[PDB]
Each structure stands twice: as C-alpha cells, then as structure tokens.
CSV table of C-alpha atoms in Angstrom, one decimal:
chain,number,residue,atom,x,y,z
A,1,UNK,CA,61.2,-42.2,-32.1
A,2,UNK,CA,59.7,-43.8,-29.1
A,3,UNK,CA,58.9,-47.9,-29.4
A,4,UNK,CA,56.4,-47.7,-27.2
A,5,UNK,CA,52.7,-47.3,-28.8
A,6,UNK,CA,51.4,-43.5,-28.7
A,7,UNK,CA,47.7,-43.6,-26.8
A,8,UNK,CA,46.1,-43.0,-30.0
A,9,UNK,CA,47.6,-46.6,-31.2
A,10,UNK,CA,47.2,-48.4,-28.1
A,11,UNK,CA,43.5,-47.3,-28.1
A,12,UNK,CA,43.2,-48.4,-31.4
A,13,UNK,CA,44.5,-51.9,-31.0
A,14,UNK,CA,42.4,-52.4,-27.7
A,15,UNK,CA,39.4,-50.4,-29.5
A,16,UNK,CA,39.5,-53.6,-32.8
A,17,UNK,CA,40.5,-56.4,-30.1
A,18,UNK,CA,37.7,-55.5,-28.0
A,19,UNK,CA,35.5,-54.7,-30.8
A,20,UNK,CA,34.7,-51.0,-29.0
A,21,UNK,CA,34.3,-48.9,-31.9
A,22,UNK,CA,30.1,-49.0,-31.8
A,23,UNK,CA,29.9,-48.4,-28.4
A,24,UNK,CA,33.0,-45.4,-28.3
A,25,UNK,CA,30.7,-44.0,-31.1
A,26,UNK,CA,27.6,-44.6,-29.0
A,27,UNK,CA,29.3,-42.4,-25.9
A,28,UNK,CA,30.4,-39.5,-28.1
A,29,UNK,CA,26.5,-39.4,-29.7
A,30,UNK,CA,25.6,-39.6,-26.2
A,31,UNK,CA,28.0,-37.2,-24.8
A,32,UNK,CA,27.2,-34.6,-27.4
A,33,UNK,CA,25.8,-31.2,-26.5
A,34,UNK,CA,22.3,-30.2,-28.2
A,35,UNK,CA,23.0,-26.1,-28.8
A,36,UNK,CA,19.8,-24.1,-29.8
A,37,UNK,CA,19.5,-24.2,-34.0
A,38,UNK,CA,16.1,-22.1,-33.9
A,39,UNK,CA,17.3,-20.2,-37.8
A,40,UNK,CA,17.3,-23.3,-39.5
A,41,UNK,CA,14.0,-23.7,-38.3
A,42,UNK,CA,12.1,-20.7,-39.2
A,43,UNK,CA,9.7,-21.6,-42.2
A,44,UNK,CA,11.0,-19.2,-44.7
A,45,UNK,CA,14.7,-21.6,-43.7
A,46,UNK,CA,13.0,-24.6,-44.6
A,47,UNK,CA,13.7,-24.6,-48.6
A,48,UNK,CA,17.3,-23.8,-47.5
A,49,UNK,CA,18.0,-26.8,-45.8
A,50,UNK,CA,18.5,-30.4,-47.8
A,51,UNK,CA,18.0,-32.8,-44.4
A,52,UNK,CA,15.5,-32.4,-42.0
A,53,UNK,CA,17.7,-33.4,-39.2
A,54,UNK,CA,20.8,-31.4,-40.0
A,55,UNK,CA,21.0,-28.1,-39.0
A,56,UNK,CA,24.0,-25.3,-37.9
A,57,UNK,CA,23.9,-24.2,-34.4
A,58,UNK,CA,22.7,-20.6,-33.9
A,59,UNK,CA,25.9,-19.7,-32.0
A,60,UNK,CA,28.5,-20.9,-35.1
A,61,UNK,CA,26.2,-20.5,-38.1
A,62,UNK,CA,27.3,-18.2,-41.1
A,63,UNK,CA,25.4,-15.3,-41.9
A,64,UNK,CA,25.1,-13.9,-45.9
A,65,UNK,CA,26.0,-10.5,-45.0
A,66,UNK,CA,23.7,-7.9,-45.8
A,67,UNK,CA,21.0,-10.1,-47.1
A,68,UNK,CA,16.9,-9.9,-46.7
A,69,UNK,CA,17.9,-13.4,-45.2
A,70,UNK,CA,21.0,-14.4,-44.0
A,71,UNK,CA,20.6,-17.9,-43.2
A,72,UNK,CA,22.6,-20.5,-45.3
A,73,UNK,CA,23.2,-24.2,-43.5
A,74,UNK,CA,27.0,-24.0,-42.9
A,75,UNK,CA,28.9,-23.9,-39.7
A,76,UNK,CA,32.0,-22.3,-39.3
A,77,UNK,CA,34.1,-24.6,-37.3
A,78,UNK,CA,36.9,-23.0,-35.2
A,79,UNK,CA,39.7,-24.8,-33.4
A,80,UNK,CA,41.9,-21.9,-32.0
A,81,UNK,CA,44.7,-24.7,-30.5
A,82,UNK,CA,45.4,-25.6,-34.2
A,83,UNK,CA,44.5,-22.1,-36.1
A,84,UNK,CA,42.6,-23.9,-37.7
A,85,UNK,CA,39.0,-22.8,-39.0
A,86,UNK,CA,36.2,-24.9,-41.6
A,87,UNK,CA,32.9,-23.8,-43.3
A,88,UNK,CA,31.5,-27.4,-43.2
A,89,UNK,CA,28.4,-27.0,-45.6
A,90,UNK,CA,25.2,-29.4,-47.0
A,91,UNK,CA,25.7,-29.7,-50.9
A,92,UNK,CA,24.1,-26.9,-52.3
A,93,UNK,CA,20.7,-26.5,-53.1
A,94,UNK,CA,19.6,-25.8,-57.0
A,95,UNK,CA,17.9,-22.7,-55.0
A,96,UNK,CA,21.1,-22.0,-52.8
A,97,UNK,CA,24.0,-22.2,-55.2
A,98,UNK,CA,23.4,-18.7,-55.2
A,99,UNK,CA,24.0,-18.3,-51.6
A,100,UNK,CA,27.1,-20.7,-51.5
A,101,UNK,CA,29.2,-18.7,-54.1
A,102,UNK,CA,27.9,-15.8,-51.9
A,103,UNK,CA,29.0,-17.0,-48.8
A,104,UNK,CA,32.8,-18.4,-50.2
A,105,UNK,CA,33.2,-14.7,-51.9
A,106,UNK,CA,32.7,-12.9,-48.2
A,107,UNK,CA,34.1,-15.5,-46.4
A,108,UNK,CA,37.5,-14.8,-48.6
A,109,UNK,CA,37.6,-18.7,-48.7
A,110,UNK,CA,40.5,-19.9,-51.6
A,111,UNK,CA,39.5,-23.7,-51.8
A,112,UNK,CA,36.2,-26.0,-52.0
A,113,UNK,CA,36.3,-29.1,-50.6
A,114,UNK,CA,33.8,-31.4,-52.2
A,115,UNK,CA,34.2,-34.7,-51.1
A,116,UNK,CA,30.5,-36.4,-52.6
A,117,UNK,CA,29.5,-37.4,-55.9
A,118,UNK,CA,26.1,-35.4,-56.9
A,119,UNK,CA,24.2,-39.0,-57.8
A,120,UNK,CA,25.0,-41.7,-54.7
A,121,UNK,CA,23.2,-44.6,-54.8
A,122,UNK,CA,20.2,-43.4,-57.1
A,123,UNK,CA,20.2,-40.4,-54.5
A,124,UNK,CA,20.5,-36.7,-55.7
A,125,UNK,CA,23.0,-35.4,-53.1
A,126,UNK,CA,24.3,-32.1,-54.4
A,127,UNK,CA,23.1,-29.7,-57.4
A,128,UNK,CA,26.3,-28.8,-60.3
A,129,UNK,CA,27.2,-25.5,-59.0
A,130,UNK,CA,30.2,-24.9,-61.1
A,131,UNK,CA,30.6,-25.7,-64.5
A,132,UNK,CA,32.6,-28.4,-66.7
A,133,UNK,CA,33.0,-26.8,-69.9
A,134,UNK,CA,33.7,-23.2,-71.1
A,135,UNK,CA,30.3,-21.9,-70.4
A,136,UNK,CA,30.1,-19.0,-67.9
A,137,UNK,CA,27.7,-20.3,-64.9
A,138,UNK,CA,25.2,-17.7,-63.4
A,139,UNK,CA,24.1,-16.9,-60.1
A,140,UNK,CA,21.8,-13.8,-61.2
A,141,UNK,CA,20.4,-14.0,-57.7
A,142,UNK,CA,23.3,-12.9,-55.5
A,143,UNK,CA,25.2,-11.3,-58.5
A,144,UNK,CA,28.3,-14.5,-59.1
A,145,UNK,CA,29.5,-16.0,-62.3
A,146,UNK,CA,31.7,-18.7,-62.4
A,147,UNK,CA,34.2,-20.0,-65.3
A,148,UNK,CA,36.2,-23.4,-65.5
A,149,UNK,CA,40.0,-21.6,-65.8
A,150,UNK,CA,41.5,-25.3,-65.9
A,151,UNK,CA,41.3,-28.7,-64.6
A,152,UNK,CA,43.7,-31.8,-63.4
A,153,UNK,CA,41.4,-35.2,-63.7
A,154,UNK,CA,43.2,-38.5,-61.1
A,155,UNK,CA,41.3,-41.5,-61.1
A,156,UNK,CA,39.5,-40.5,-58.1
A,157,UNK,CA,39.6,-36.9,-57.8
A,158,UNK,CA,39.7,-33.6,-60.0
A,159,UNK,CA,40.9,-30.0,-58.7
A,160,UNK,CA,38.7,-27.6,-61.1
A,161,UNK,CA,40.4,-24.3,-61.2
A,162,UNK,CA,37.1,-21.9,-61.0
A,163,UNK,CA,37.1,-18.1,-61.7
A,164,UNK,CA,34.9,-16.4,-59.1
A,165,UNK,CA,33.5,-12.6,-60.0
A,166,UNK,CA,31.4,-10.5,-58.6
A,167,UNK,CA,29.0,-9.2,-61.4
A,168,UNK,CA,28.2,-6.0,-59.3
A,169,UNK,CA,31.9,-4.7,-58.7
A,170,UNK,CA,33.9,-6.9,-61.6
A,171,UNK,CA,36.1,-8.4,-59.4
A,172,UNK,CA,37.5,-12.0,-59.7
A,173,UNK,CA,39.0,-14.7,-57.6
A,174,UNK,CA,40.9,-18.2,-58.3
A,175,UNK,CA,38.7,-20.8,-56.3
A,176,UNK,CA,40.9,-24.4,-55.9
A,177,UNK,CA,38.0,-26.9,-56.0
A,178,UNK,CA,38.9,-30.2,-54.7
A,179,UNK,CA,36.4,-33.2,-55.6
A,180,UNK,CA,36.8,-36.5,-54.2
A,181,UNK,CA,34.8,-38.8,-56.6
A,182,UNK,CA,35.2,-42.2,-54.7
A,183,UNK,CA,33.9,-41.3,-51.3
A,184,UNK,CA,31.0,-43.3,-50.7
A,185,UNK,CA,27.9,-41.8,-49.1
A,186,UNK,CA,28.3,-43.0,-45.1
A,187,UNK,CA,31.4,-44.5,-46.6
A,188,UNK,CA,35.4,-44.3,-46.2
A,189,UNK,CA,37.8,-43.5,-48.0
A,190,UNK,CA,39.7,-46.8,-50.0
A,191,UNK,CA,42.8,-46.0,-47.7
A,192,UNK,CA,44.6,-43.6,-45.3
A,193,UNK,CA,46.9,-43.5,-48.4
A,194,UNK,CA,44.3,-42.2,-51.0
A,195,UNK,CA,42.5,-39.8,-48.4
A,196,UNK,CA,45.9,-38.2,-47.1
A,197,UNK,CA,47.2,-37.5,-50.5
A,198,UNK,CA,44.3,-35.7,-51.0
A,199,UNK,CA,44.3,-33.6,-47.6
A,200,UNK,CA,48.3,-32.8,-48.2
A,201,UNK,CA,46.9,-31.5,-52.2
A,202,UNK,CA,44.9,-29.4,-50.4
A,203,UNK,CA,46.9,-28.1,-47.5
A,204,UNK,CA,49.7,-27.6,-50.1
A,205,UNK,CA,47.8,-25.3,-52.3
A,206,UNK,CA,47.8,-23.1,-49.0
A,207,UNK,CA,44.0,-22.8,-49.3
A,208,UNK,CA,43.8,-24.3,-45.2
A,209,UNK,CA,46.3,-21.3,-44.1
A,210,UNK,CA,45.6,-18.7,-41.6
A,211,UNK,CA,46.3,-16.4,-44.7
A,212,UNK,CA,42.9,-17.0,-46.6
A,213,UNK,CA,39.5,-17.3,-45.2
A,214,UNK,CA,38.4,-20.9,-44.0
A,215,UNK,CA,38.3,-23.5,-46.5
A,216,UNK,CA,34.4,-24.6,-47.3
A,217,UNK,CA,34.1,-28.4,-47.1
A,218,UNK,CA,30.6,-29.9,-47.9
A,219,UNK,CA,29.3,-33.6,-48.9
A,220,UNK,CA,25.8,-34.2,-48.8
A,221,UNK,CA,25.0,-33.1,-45.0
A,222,UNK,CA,28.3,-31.3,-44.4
A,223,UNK,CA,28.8,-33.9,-41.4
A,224,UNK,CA,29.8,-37.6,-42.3
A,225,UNK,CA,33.1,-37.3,-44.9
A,226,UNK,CA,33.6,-33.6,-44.0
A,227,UNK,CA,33.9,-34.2,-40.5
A,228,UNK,CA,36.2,-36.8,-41.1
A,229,UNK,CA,38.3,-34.7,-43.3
A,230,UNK,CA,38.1,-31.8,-41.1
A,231,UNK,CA,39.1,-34.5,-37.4
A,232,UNK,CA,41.8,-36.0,-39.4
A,233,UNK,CA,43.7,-32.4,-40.6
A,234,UNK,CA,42.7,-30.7,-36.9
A,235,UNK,CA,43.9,-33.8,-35.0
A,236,UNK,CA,47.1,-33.7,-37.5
A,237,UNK,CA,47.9,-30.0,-36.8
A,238,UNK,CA,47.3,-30.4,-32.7
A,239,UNK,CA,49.9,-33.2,-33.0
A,240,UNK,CA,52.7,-31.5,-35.3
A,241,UNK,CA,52.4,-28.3,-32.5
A,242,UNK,CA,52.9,-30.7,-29.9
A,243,UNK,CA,49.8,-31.3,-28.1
A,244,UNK,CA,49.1,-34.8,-26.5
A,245,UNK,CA,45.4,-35.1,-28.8
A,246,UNK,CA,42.5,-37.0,-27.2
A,247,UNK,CA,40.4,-37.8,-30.7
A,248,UNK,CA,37.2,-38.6,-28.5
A,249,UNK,CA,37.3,-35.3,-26.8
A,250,UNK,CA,39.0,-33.1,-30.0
A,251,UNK,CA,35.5,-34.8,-32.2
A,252,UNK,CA,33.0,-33.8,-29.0
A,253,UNK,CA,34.6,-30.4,-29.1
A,254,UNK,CA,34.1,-29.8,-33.2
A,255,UNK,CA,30.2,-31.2,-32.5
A,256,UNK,CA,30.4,-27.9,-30.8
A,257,UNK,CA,30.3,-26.6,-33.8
A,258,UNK,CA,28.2,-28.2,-36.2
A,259,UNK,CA,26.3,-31.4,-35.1
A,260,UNK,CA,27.0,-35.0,-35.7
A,261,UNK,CA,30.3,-34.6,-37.1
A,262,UNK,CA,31.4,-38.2,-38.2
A,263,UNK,CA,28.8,-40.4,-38.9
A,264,UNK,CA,29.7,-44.2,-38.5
A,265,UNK,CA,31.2,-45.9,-36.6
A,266,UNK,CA,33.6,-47.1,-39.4
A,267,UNK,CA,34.3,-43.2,-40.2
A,268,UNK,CA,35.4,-43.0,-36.8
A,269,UNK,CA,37.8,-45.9,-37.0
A,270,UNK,CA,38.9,-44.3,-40.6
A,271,UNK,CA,39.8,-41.2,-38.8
A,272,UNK,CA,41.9,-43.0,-36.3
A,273,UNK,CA,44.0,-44.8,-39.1
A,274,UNK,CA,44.3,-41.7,-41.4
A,275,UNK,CA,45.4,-39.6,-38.1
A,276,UNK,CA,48.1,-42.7,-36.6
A,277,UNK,CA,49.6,-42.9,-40.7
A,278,UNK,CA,49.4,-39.5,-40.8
A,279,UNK,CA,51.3,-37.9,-37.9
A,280,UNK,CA,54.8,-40.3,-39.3
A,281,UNK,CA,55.0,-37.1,-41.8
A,286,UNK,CA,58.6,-35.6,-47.7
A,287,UNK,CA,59.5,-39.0,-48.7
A,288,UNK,CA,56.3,-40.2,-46.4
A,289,UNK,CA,53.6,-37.5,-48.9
A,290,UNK,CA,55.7,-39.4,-51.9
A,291,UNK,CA,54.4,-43.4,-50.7
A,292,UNK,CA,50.6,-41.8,-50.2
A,293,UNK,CA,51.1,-40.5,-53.3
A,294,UNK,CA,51.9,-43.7,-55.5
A,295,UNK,CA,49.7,-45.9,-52.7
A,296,UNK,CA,47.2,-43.5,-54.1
A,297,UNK,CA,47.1,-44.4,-57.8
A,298,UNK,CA,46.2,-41.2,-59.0
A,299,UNK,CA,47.6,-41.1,-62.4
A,300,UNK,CA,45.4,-44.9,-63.2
C-alpha cells in the first residue's frame, strides 16, 4: 500500500547495516525502570521463585486469592491501547504447580502458553504440570486435578486439551495448552513463519480475547521467549487498530510490567522480523502455515 519503507523497516535495515542491534538492546537495559519487587523477596518467597534475579514487580504481581500466602512469580502485563492483557510466568516449580493451576482457575485464563522444553541443554527448566496419558494429575494442595481431554502433536509443537476442576466445588474448565517444543533457551524461533503460525493458533482459539481472562505465557523465567511472544502479538494488535508503534518504547513500557522482557539481542531482532512479516496480514496465515512444516 505505500512503497516507501514503514519506520519499523527502515529501522531495521539501518539497525543490520549499522550493526545496532547490541547497543539498541544496551539503551533499552539501560533505559529500564527498576520498580520495588520486595514480595519476591521475603524468605518464606524464596522456594517460590526458580531464578534469583527474576522477580514480578510489587505493583503488577498476581496475588492467589485468599491464600495464607499469596505470592506466585507472575506478572500480569496490561497494555490498555491494544486490550490486550498477559500472565507472563517462570515454569512452575514441582512445589508451585499447585499454585499455577490455582492462579489460571481465578484468573479465568482459557489458554497456556508454554513456549520451553522442561530439559534445555542438560538444564531442568520447568516441572510436568499436566499430564500426557489418561492419568488424572493432582494438585491436593490447592484442591486442582487435571486430565488430558485430547491432543494435536506438529513437528514442533502440540496443543494438549487439559480438563481443569476444582476438587472443592466440582467444577471443570477446557484449558488450550500451547507448547512450543523448538524454542531454544535464549534462543529464536527457526522463522517469523513457524513462530506466527503458532501465535495466529493461539489467537484463533480466542484464548487472547477480551472475553476470557489473560492468557498465561511462561518459559523458563517468564521473560526471554514470552516476552517476545507477548511484543510481537501487542506490537501486531497496536498496528491492526492504527497506531504508528515505536517497538523500543512499546518493549520499555511492558518492562513496566515484568522486568527484562526480551532477553538477547537476537530476540530483539526476532521480534522486529516476526512484527514487519506479520502486520502484511487469510491467504498470508495459509504461507506461515506450510512455511511452518507442521504436519513433518
């Protein structure tokens, strides 16, 4: 529609030809605001939290309602100019799987985004919090069960159909849980094709609607790959509304909201190319789709 690059591909070009991308990543470390995370740092917290070093602001943290203690290390991330809200989470615990089925059944959330592997790189990144076979999972210590209802296996992710229910009041709920199996750890996706498949499986579920509660999205930390999925779909939405999107500022105001959001330079540039293929969007979902090689 116009021949003339947008500023989002002009900066990119200039950004490779100048070789920029460290030191853009540099300012936006440097630019972010510090807010006060003192809950994640109470003792009793400490066996809650997987890294040292990553921790939900006080001011966007989500509570467990009506808990002895309400801390769990997800932020909810809240862009009002897109209607857009995120739980970005660490990968559960072993001790706070518990607290994550907990937090999606109050939350109202429809979909989990998982976009790790539990083992990267010899690494334990995530405990199994939902099961593979037909065996009924147990969370006796906030009162969840959850079943496999069905699943859809592509050669680098699976949507596991999960039945949620609250033991103490019998009550069920369809989870959509999306796993990514061939994100890397500080990694990228293998193209803007591959990942935007994935993000349109996801938005087309409905699970990212205004609708539902926000959609939980957690890797390891719940900063690297889910803020890049989490940039890519808010920058997307700003731009389909009509906004003229600054990514640099748009990333500085989701650190806002949970710390460190992106975490190489390379998931920076990622984000740039994912959100430049991504704004030409039914024909367009169809090429990402075969580009993807999801039935291999």
């Amino acid at each position: 529609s116009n021949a003339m690059p947008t500023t989002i591909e002009r900066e990119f070009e200039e950004l490779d030809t100048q070789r920029r991308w460290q030191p853009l990543y540099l300012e936006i470390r440097n630019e972010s605001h510090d807010y006060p995370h003192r809950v994640a740092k109470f003792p009793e917290n400490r066996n809650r939290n997987r890294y040292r070093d990553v921790s939900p602001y006080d001011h966007s943290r989500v509570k467990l309602q009506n808990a002895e203690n309400d801390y769990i290390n997800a932020s909810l991330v809240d862009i009002e100019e897109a209607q857009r809200s995120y739980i970005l989470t660490q990968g559960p615990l072993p001790n706070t799987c518990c607290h994550f089925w907990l937090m999606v059944w109050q939350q109202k959330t429809k979909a989990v985004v998982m976009l790790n592997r539990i083992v990267e790189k010899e690494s334990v990144k995530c405990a199994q919090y939902w099961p593979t076979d037909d065996q009924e999972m147990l969370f006796k210590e906030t009162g969840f069960s959850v079943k496999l209802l069905s699943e859809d296996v592509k050669s680098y992710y699976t949507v596991h159909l999960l039945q949620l229910e609250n033991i103490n009041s019998g009550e069920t709920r369809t989870i959509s849980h999306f796993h990514y199996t061939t994100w890397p750890d500080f990694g990228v996706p293998e193209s803007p094709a591959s990942f935007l498949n994935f993000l349109f499986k996801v938005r087309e579920s409905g699970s990212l609607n205004p609708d539902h509660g926000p959609a939980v999205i957690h890797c390891s930390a719940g900063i690297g790959r889910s803020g890049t999925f989490s940039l890519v779909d808010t920058c997307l939405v700003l731009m389909e509304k009509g906004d003229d999107i600054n990514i640099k500022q748009v990333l500085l105001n989701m650190r806002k909201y949970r710390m460190g959001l992106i975490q190489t330079p390379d998931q920076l540039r990622f984000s740039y190319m994912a959100i430049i293929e991504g704004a030409k969007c039914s024909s367009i979902q169809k090429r990402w789709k075969e580009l993807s090689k999801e039935d291999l």
